[PDB]
Amino acid sequence: DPMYEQFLQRIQAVRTATVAKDISADILEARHDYFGRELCRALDIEYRNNVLLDEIILDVYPGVNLMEYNVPHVTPANYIWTGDMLLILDYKVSVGHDSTEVTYKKYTTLILPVMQEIGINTEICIIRANPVTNQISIVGEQFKRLFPTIPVELNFARFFELRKMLLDKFAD
């Protein structure tokens, strides 16, 4: 597994906590992306890794008069367009609620006002996996409606093992 081996090489090479904090950041992002990929495959929805909100608008409403709107330059993880409603998607891997609430509120603040101006009915959806228990939590009523079951097969062990190496290397 190349992703694992690349992290391992950085972890064995790293000598200082400050450089190691960048590795930890990257491991957490890779874990986020891994979950997003598995979720999307299980639901048979398209996996994207951060799309500009301008791109989303043009995909769903190519005929929009884009110049007339002030579109915040935000990049959500993904989206689903049903033909009537746009579900803005992000995923989290965390044992707690807190990072989900932060992102949900950020997406609500930056995305929903302009989508309302444009006239596209839009909802923020965040799907969270608990990395220890593999249980899934969803915020987003329409997302729950469309996918009442999520048949993901999750295994976060390789991410924990890598983070545990970093913790052990810098335990002092």
Short mmCIF file of C-alpha atoms in Angstrom, two decimals:
data_model
loop_
_atom_site.label_atom_id
_atom_site.label_comp_id
_atom_site.label_asym_id
_atom_site.label_seq_id
_atom_site.Cartn_x
_atom_site.Cartn_y
_atom_site.Cartn_z
CA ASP A 1 0.00 0.00 0.00
CA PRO A 2 1.83 3.09 -1.30
CA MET A 3 0.07 5.64 0.91
CA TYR A 4 1.08 3.69 4.03
CA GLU A 5 4.69 3.25 2.90
CA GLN A 6 5.04 6.94 2.06
CA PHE A 7 3.87 7.95 5.53
CA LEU A 8 6.11 5.32 7.12
CA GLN A 9 9.15 6.70 5.31
CA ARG A 10 8.40 10.24 6.47
CA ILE A 11 7.80 9.05 10.02
CA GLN A 12 11.05 7.15 10.22
CA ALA A 13 12.93 10.10 8.69
CA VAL A 14 11.34 12.85 10.79
CA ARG A 15 13.43 14.19 13.68
CA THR A 16 11.48 17.09 15.19
CA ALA A 17 8.00 17.61 16.57
CA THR A 18 7.34 20.66 14.40
CA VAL A 19 7.96 18.78 11.15
CA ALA A 20 6.08 15.77 12.56
CA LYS A 21 2.98 17.93 13.06
CA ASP A 22 2.78 18.27 9.26
CA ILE A 23 2.86 14.47 8.90
CA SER A 24 0.05 14.11 11.44
CA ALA A 25 -1.98 16.71 9.55
CA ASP A 26 -1.45 14.78 6.32
CA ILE A 27 -2.38 11.47 7.94
CA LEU A 28 -5.65 12.93 9.20
CA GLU A 29 -6.42 14.29 5.73
CA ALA A 30 -5.67 10.92 4.13
CA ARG A 31 -8.01 9.27 6.65
CA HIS A 32 -10.73 11.81 5.76
CA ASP A 33 -10.22 11.11 2.04
CA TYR A 34 -10.18 7.34 2.55
CA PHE A 35 -13.55 7.48 4.30
CA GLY A 36 -14.99 9.75 1.60
CA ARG A 37 -13.84 7.35 -1.12
CA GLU A 38 -15.33 4.34 0.65
CA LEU A 39 -18.58 6.14 1.41
CA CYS A 40 -18.99 7.28 -2.18
CA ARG A 41 -18.21 3.84 -3.59
CA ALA A 42 -20.70 2.18 -1.22
CA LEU A 43 -23.44 4.66 -2.15
CA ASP A 44 -22.50 4.67 -5.87
CA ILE A 45 -22.09 8.45 -5.89
CA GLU A 46 -19.23 10.28 -7.56
CA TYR A 47 -16.13 10.84 -5.40
CA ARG A 48 -14.66 14.33 -5.67
CA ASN A 49 -11.89 15.84 -3.55
CA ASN A 50 -12.86 19.49 -2.99
CA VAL A 51 -14.75 21.27 -5.76
CA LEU A 52 -15.03 25.04 -6.00
CA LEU A 53 -18.53 26.33 -5.31
CA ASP A 54 -18.44 28.10 -8.70
CA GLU A 55 -17.88 24.71 -10.36
CA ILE A 56 -20.82 23.19 -8.49
CA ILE A 57 -23.16 26.02 -9.60
CA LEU A 58 -22.11 25.63 -13.26
CA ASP A 59 -22.55 21.84 -13.16
CA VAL A 60 -26.12 22.06 -11.87
CA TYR A 61 -27.14 25.34 -13.57
CA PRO A 62 -24.88 25.87 -16.59
CA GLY A 63 -27.18 28.64 -17.82
CA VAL A 64 -26.82 30.72 -14.66
CA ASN A 65 -25.79 34.36 -15.14
CA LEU A 66 -22.72 33.77 -13.01
CA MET A 67 -21.34 37.32 -13.29
CA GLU A 68 -24.36 38.73 -11.43
CA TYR A 69 -23.59 36.87 -8.17
CA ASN A 70 -20.88 37.17 -5.54
CA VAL A 71 -19.87 33.52 -5.09
CA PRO A 72 -17.66 32.87 -2.02
CA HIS A 73 -14.55 30.88 -3.09
CA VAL A 74 -15.30 27.95 -0.74
CA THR A 75 -14.38 24.35 -1.68
CA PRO A 76 -16.67 21.73 -0.12
CA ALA A 77 -15.67 18.09 -0.30
CA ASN A 78 -18.38 16.91 -2.64
CA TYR A 79 -21.98 17.37 -3.69
CA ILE A 80 -25.00 15.46 -4.95
CA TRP A 81 -27.40 17.04 -7.46
CA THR A 82 -30.76 15.25 -7.62
CA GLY A 83 -32.39 17.50 -10.27
CA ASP A 84 -34.43 19.36 -7.62
CA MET A 85 -32.02 19.82 -4.75
CA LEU A 86 -28.31 20.25 -4.22
CA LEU A 87 -26.78 18.39 -1.28
CA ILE A 88 -23.43 19.88 -0.27
CA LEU A 89 -21.35 17.06 1.19
CA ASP A 90 -18.45 16.72 3.59
CA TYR A 91 -17.18 13.81 5.63
CA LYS A 92 -15.48 13.63 9.02
CA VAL A 93 -13.59 10.93 10.87
CA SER A 94 -13.78 11.67 14.60
CA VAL A 95 -14.99 10.10 17.84
CA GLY A 96 -16.82 13.35 18.68
CA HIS A 97 -19.28 15.93 17.25
CA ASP A 98 -17.16 19.03 17.40
CA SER A 99 -15.40 19.15 14.01
CA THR A 100 -18.72 18.32 12.34
CA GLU A 101 -20.46 21.31 13.90
CA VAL A 102 -17.64 23.64 12.86
CA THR A 103 -17.80 22.60 9.23
CA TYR A 104 -21.61 22.46 9.11
CA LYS A 105 -21.74 26.06 10.33
CA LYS A 106 -19.01 27.22 7.96
CA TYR A 107 -20.74 25.65 4.95
CA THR A 108 -24.10 27.06 6.03
CA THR A 109 -22.69 30.59 6.34
CA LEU A 110 -20.77 30.63 3.06
CA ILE A 111 -22.83 28.49 0.65
CA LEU A 112 -26.52 28.80 1.42
CA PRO A 113 -27.05 32.58 0.97
CA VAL A 114 -25.76 32.71 -2.59
CA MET A 115 -27.50 29.47 -3.60
CA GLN A 116 -30.72 31.10 -2.36
CA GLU A 117 -30.00 34.18 -4.52
CA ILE A 118 -29.43 31.93 -7.53
CA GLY A 119 -32.52 29.88 -6.72
CA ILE A 120 -31.12 26.38 -6.17
CA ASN A 121 -32.58 24.58 -3.20
CA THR A 122 -29.52 23.59 -1.20
CA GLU A 123 -28.80 21.56 1.95
CA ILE A 124 -25.58 20.98 3.93
CA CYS A 125 -24.87 17.31 4.72
CA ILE A 126 -22.01 15.99 6.86
CA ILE A 127 -21.37 12.27 7.31
CA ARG A 128 -19.16 11.21 10.21
CA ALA A 129 -17.46 7.88 10.84
CA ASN A 130 -16.21 6.98 14.30
CA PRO A 131 -12.71 5.63 13.61
CA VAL A 132 -12.83 3.19 16.56
CA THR A 133 -16.38 1.81 16.26
CA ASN A 134 -16.97 2.39 12.50
CA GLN A 135 -20.43 3.73 13.32
CA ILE A 136 -21.85 6.36 10.95
CA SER A 137 -23.72 9.53 11.92
CA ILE A 138 -25.45 11.83 9.46
CA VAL A 139 -26.53 15.45 9.62
CA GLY A 140 -28.78 16.29 6.69
CA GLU A 141 -32.42 15.19 6.49
CA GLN A 142 -32.46 14.80 2.72
CA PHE A 143 -29.27 12.73 2.78
CA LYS A 144 -30.86 10.32 5.25
CA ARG A 145 -33.91 10.09 3.00
CA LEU A 146 -31.89 9.16 -0.09
CA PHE A 147 -29.59 6.66 1.68
CA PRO A 148 -31.37 5.08 4.66
CA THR A 149 -28.53 2.53 4.87
CA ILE A 150 -24.79 3.01 4.30
CA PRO A 151 -23.08 -0.30 3.45
CA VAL A 152 -19.50 0.89 3.94
CA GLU A 153 -16.74 -1.48 4.94
CA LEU A 154 -14.35 0.64 7.00
CA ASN A 155 -10.93 -0.22 8.45
CA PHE A 156 -8.96 2.69 9.91
CA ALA A 157 -6.28 0.52 11.55
CA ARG A 158 -3.43 1.64 9.26
CA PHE A 159 -4.05 5.31 10.13
CA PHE A 160 -3.99 4.64 13.87
CA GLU A 161 -0.82 2.58 13.55
CA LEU A 162 0.90 5.46 11.74
CA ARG A 163 -0.25 8.04 14.26
CA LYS A 164 0.85 5.76 17.10
CA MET A 165 4.38 5.65 15.64
CA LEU A 166 4.43 9.45 15.67
CA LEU A 167 3.13 9.56 19.24
CA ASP A 168 5.75 7.03 20.40
CA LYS A 169 8.56 8.84 18.61
CA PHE A 170 7.69 12.13 20.34
CA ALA A 171 6.33 10.86 23.66
CA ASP A 172 8.58 13.26 25.64
#
